[PDB]
Amino acid sequence: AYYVGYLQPRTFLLKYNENGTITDAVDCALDPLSETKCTLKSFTVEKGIYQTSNFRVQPTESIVRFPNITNLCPFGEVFNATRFAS
Amino acid sequence: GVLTESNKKFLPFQQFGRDIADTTDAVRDPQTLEILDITPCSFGGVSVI
């Protein structure tokens, strides 16, 4: 029996111990508390309100518009004419 | 800088160390493989009285 997981491009905050080893880590896009810890760059948060990021609505599609009619052009009478010159 | 016999211990895979803003505070020599610490030599201002 073995377990298989996957890796994605996330961001982590690591707490290095005095001896140099890693003793605790915090994911940065797991919970709003995680974003608060990332922005504060600390593992503990006190009471209050903190701005962590910004919310932007992204565009959905694109539209292009132009004059209603198209001025039509004599190619129909230049190509399909009765007679041409020599 | 001025080199000193470092007291902190390195895991067998690092090469140097830093504390804040890429300030290299330690290094290991490539030959003796001994962990040394780096600190700048003294500097300061001059005043006339």
Partner: peptide
Amino acid sequence: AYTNSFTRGVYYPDKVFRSSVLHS
């Protein structure tokens, strides 16, 4: 079968020693 990986899967991203430093 599925299982929840609580907090595992963390390693040393670089070969630079650090001590008592909170690094992102």
